[PDB]
C-alpha cells in the first residue's frame, strides 16, 4: 500500500521544484499515473481482504473509493487551471499542495486498519479543505461557510473520539479485523444508547443527515471548483464509509436506534428534493441534490442488509462522479457569466451545443436512468427498503419523481428557451472543459458494464 502513498507524497517536491510554467503539466501527468496504479487494488478477493501490513488494508469497499480519490485529483487540477491564471507561482504551488495533502489523507484513511488512525486522518482532511475554502473563495460568505464546515464537523466528531478510546479500554483493540472477529452484542442500556449515539453522530453529520445539513450548501457554494468537486465526490462518502465500518459493534441496538434517523432521511430526502424545485442558484441546487442522494445512502446503511450495502456502495460512487460533473458544468457557465444565478444565462444550447450534450448526459445520470450505476444503487436500496417495509415505496417512489423533475428543470432553464440578448461574452467551449466533461462521464458508462467492481464486499 506504500506503492501508492509514496508517489503521492513525492508529488509535493516535484510540484515545489517545477518551473513556473510546468507545474500543471507535471502535476496532471504524475497524478494520472498514480491513478493507474490504483486500478491494481481492485483485483479484490471474495475472502477477507488485502491485508498489506499491520497498518493498512484494502477491501472491495475501500478499493472503489481509493480509485475515485486518485482519479479526482487530475480533474481538480484541470478545473483549477483556469481561474488561477492571474495568481502568483508560490500561491499556485500552495493550492496544488493543499490538493495533494488532501489526497494523501484520503488515501490513508481508507487503508487505516485501526479506528484511531482512521479518526485522525478523517479529521486531518478537515484542515486542507478549510484552507482551500477560506483562502481561494470569491464571495465574502466563504468565511462563514468555513466556520460552519468546521464546527458542525467537530461537534459530531469529538464525542466519537471519546467513544473510540472507551472501546479500546474495554475490548483492548481498535483494529478492524479483531473488532469484527471478537464482536459481541450491545445490550439495551442507557450507557449503550449514548455510546451508539457517539459512534453514529460523527459520520451522520458528514453525510449530511437532514437537519444537520446546514453546513453543506454554504461550504459547497462559496468553495472554489476544486473544493466543491472534492467535497461532493469524496468527502461526503467518508461518513458512509465510517458508518459501514462501525455498525459492526452496534448490533442489535441499531434495530431500533435507527428509527429517528431513517425517518429524518425518508422524509428529508423528499423535503430537500422539493427545495431543488425552487432554487435561484445552480450550486445550491446541486448541493441539495447531494443531500437527497446521501439521505438515501443513510437509509441503506441503517437497514443493514446485503442489498442495502451493495446499493449504498454503488450509489456513493455514482453520486461522486455525477455531482463532480454537475459542479464542473456549473463552473464553466460561471466563469463566463460571473453570476451563478440560474435564470440569468438562458438558451445556451444554441451557443454551446457540446456543453448542451454534456449537460444532458449529466442530468440523465442524476436522473437515475437505466442501466447507469446510479439506477443500480437506487434500485438495490429501494428493494431493500421495500423488504424492510412495504410502505417506504411511496416515499421512495415520490422521491424519484421529484428528482427527475428538478433535474430536467435544471436542463430546461439553462439550455433551452431563448438566449439572453445582452450577454455577448459566451466564447466557445475550450478543449480543456470538453476533456474534463468526457473524463467525468466516460468512467460512469464504463463502470455500468462491470458493476461488481463497485458493489462492495457483500457482492
Amino acid at each position: 500500500m506504500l506503492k501508492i502513498i509514496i508517489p503521492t507524497t513525492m508529488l509535493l517536491p516535484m510540484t515545489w521544484m517545477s518551473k513556473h510554467n510546468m507545474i500543471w503539466i507535471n502535476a496532471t501527468v504524475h497524478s494520472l499515473l498514480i491513478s493507474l496504479i490504483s486500478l491494481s487494488l481492485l483485483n479484490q478477493l471474495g475472502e477477507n481482504s488485502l491485508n498489506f501490513s499491520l497498518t493498512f488494508f484494502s477491501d472491495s469497499l475501500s478499493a472503489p473509493l481509493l480509485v475515485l480519490t486518485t482519479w479526482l485529483l487530475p480533474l481538480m487540477l484541470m478545473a483549477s487551471q483556469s481561474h488561477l491564471s492571474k495568481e502568483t507561482t508560490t500561491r499556485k504551488k500552495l493550492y496544488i499542495t493543499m490538493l495533494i495533502l488532501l489526497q494523501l489523507f484520503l488515501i490513508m484513511t481508507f487503508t487505516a486498519t485501526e479506528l484511531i488512525l482512521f479518526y485522525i486522518l478523517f479529521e486531518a482532511t478537515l484542515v486542507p479543505t478549510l484552507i482551500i475554502i477560506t483562502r481561494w473563495g470569491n464571495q465574502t460568505e466563504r468565511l462563514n461557510a468555513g466556520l460552519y464546515f468546521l464546527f458542525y464537523t467537530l461537534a459530531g466528531s469529538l464525542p466519537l473520539l471519546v467513544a473510540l478510546v472507551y472501546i479500546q479500554n474495554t475490548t483492548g483493540s481498535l483494529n478492524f479485523l479483531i473488532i469484527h472477529y471478537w464482536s459481541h452484542p450491545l445490550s439495551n442500556s442507557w450507557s449503550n444508547i449514548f455510546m451508539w449515539l457517539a459512534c453514529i453522530m460523527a459520520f451522520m453529520v458528514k453525510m449530511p443527515l437532514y437537519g444537520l445539513h446546514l453546513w453543506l450548501p454554504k461550504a459547497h457554494v462559496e468553495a472554489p471548483i476544486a473544493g466543491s468537486m472534492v467535497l461532493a465526490a469524496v468527502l461526503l462518502k467518508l461518513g458512509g464509509y465510517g458508518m459501514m465500518r462501525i455498525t459492526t459493534i452496534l448490533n442489535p441496538l441499531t434495530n431500533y436506534m435507527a428509527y429517528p434517523f431513517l425517518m429524518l432521511s425518508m422524509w428529508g430526502m423528499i423535503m430537500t428534493s422539493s427545495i431543488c424545485l425552487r432554487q435561484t442558484d445552480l450550486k445550491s441546487l446541486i448541493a441539495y441534490s447531494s443531500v437527497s442522494h446521501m439521505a438515501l445512502v443513510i437509509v441503506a446503511i441503517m437497514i443493514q442488509t446485503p442489498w442495502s450495502f451493495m446499493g449504498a456502495t454503488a450509489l456513493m460512487i455514482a453520486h461522486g462522479l455525477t455531482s463532480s460533473m454537475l459542479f464542473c458544468l456549473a463552473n464553466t457557465n460561471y466563469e463566463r457569466v460571473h453570476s451563478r444565478t440560474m435564470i440569468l444565462a438562458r438558451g445556451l444550447q444554441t451557443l454551446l451545443p457540446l456543453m448542451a450534450t454534456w449537460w444532458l448526459v449529466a442530468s440523465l445520470t442524476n436522473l437515475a436512468l437505466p442501466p447507469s450505476i446510479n439506477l443500480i444503487g437506487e434500485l438495490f436500496i429501494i428493494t431493500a427498503s421495500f423488504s424492510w417495509s412495504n410502505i417506504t415505496i411511496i416515499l421512495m417512489g415520490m422521491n424519484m419523481m421529484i428528482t427527475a423533475l428538478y433535474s430536467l428543470y435544471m436542463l430546461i432553464t439553462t439550455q433551452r428557451g431563448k438566449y439572453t440578448h445582452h450577454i455577448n461574452n459566451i466564447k466557445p467551449s475550450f478543449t480543456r472543459e470538453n476533456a474534463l466533461m468526457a473524463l467525468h462521464i466516460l468512467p460512469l458508462l464504463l463502470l455500468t458494464l462491470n458493476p461488481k467492481m463497485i458493489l462492495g464486499p457483500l457482492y
Binding site: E47, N48, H180, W182, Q304, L458
Partner: protein, 175 residues
Amino acid sequence: PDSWDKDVYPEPPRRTPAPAPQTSLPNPVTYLTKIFDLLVDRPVTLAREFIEQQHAKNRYYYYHREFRRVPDITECEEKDILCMFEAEMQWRRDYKVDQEIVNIIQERLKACQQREGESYRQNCAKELEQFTQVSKAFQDRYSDLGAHYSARKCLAKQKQRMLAERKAAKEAAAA
C-alpha cells in the same frame, strides 16, 4: 456438447416431428433455411475449423483449485483468533457454494418453464418441488443474518432453531 455435464443440467430427449407436407406448394421456410445454411453456416464453420486447429497447435491446461477441510467454528475456542479465521473463511466459501447450488436449481426451473411451453404448470412440478426444498434449506441456513454476517451468527441461529426443535420434540413425545 461435451463442454458441460448433462446430468447436472438435465435435458429431455428432444422429440421432434418429421416434415410431412400435405400440399405440393413449395414452402419458403425450407428454401430460406437452405440458402441461410449455404450463405452463413459454411463460412462460420470454416472459420471455426481454422480457429480450432490454431488452438490445437498450442495446447496448455489450467486446473481447478482444491481446498482442504479445516476445523469449523464449533470446535474453536472462544478467543482463539487463528481457528476463528480459518473457520470463517471455510464458512464463507461454503456460503458461496450454496449460493451457486441455488443458482443451478433456479436455472433448471427457468429452462423447464420455457421448454414445456403451454403445459409448464404440470410438466415442471419436479423442478418446482426441488427448488422449494433447496429454498427452504437455504432460508433456514442463511436468512436474517444481516450485512455483518459471520460463522458465529449462523451458529447462534442454528442453535436457537435446534432448541425450538428439541422443545417441540420433547413436548410431542410427552403429550
